[PDB]
Symmetry: C3
């Protein structure tokens, strides 16, 4: 009856030439939110990676394959600009993409900003891992996770990842029966 440990990858894509300090804010927001959403013992695998496609692919692959993360989330590099290559790297290492995540994350942001439709944030499956691209700003990250997390535990179940147990005080997750 012991809850399974959930391994979670947190990948910050950054050239480290814009933020200076506060380079950890987005990652900290990610860990805070997921820590409140899950009852499981959690182990976070955090890495800062330059905006180089192959490096991001390698990092994602390591988090899924070596660290056995059930969930891997990225922050940064998901707009129309030249070095925003995080969605491309994500698509390359996933076997199946889940367009519904990209749709909902834009719809969620589109409530606030018209430029939400510029986002290329996506999600996909690599083996027993769900990878999702998150926004860059802590407030945006929270709103995004609040919107998409209710579908995540069931998704992780279906791809045969470990069994997330939701803190229902903070978020609701739906699991279809039968």
């Amino acid at each position: 009856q012991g809850m399974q440990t959930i391994h979670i990858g947190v990948l910050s894509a950054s050239d480290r030439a814009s933020k200076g300090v506060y380079e950890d804010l987005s990652g900290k927001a990610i860990q805070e939110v997921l820590s409140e959403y899950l009852l499981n013992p959690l182990e976070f695998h955090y890495e800062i990676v330059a905006d180089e496609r192959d490096l991001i692919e390698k990092s994602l692959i390591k988090m899924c394959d070596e660290y056995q993360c059930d969930l891997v989330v990225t922050t940064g590099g998901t707009g129309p600009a030249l070095r925003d290559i995080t969605p491309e790297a994500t698509k390359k290492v996933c076997q199946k993409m889940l367009p519904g995540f990209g749709e909902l994350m834009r719809m969620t942001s589109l409530k606030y900003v018209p430029t939400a439709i510029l986002s290329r944030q996506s999600a996909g499956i690599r083996n027993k891992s769900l990878i999702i691209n998150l926004p860059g700003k802590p407030k945006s990250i929270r709103e995004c996770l609040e919107a998409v997390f209710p579908a995540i535990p069931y998704c992780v179940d279906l791809i045969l990842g470990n069994y997330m147990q939701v803190n229902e005080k903070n978020i609701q997750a739906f699991r279809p029966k039968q």
Copy 2:
């Protein structure tokens, strides 16, 4: 003056169960169309090459104007119906996938996990549907109003809609 026969392919991707899904599909489509209908119904195992082969037969040999699948459209490993669909289609129609997810998202948050799509193969429209009767009706209710015109444009047979049951819409040509 005679209505054209519409050929409709029904592909169930998956034997102690009733195919409530297959029945739901034929029931709903029979309510929505006035035409004489011929259903080409097949059960196929969750193998990509086999689903591709079945889709190809329904479009090419049976000359189906509309082909619908049920099953195998989630994130799980053996859910390969959307892959098979993309393989046999020349054009995909992302609007269908968007609307089907938006429709289901009204009721369950896990709707965003669906990879259901739609595309064109020659004169056939192929659409991936859900797995349960209730969700199938909700799905068809949402996307059917656009189907007759789509079939018109790809040069399929002319569907005559039962307006009592579903909205008929063809834009000004």
Copy 3:
């Protein structure tokens, strides 16, 4: 100082003659709308090409690479019919696609007509150019541009295109803090 000139590409996909004498109506609608939305001096680069994928590809590439267009828009040929190959050509010349534009354009039209979901209109980036597929008719074109234009100046900023100065009397465009 003064405003930068915005270069705009307009590509009409036309299988020669089904329109008749109406051959020009879509591109003018586009010209009128953008002239109303932007304060910048504008230079349009217009071309009609046959419904052949390679020709449309070459034309888009010319507008982006040679005419240095900040915005490139196409009209027509984005439905399910066989010869509607504009989105395929668009995808081929773009480096990144922007699915949010396609979603919004379909949702906008869906408030009007159920057959909006048949559209394969898309948008994407080629270097410093934003390319967007627009509808075929003047009415739909205005409705489409009205919906998507608020996101365009900022997108063009991000891809290092010229700086659009919006006529805020006619349209509002968002640039985040």
